[PDB]
Design a protein around this nucleic acid. Structure first.
Length: 42
RNA sequence: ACGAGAACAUACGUUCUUUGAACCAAGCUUCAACUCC
């Protein structure tokens, strides 16, 4: 009923999506093939 | 009752003049605020 979480805001308080989240999502998308895509990716 | 007796190797004189510890060099790289009740 409570304990609400919060969308990411800047210091101006407008919501936005950080580019790192989309990059991590796309990293999970690209790593479908080559699951052992290693620590030292290029 | 000495090749002897006296007799300062002494006086003046800047280790000084000229000179960039400089030059080139991204605190950066890969990184989901997420997971399970």
């Amino acid at each position: 009923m409570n304990d609400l979480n919060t969308f990411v805001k800047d210091a101006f308080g407008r919501p936005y999506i950080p580019g790192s989240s989309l990059k991590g999502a796309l990293r999970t998308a690209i790593l479908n093939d080559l699951k052992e895509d290693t620590k030292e990716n290029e």
